[PDB]
Amino acid sequence: DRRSFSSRTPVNENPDGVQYRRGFVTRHQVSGWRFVMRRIASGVALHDTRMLVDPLRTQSRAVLTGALILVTGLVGCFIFS
Amino acid sequence: SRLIFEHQRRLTPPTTRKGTITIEPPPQLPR
Secondary structure (H helix, E strand, O other): OEEEOOOOOOOOOOOOOOOOOOOOOOHHHHHHHHHHHHOOOOOOOOOOOOOOOHHHHHHHHHHHHHHHHHHHHHHHOOOOO | OOOOOOOOOOOOOOOOOOOOOOOOOOOOOOO
């Protein structure tokens, strides 16, 4: 097809193979953390962790949507004046 | 005159892994 190059990483066996000390959370790490904490937090309220349907995040995103529509109407009537 | 010499075992010189490293080809520009 387009001949893609799946991410790879070998070894080093030399001097520059243990010098970096760069702490920077990549997108994957923050996604993984979100998911792990939403599979634990759904293991002490639902008592099953097959994670097929999560209602907790549903509740939280519902209250968030309430907040966002709140601020939207706030400014959309602030423009009214 | 000349003193005598013996035949030891030669110290093993540092090795040389004569490998044949294989690089993987690049991508192909989808467009």
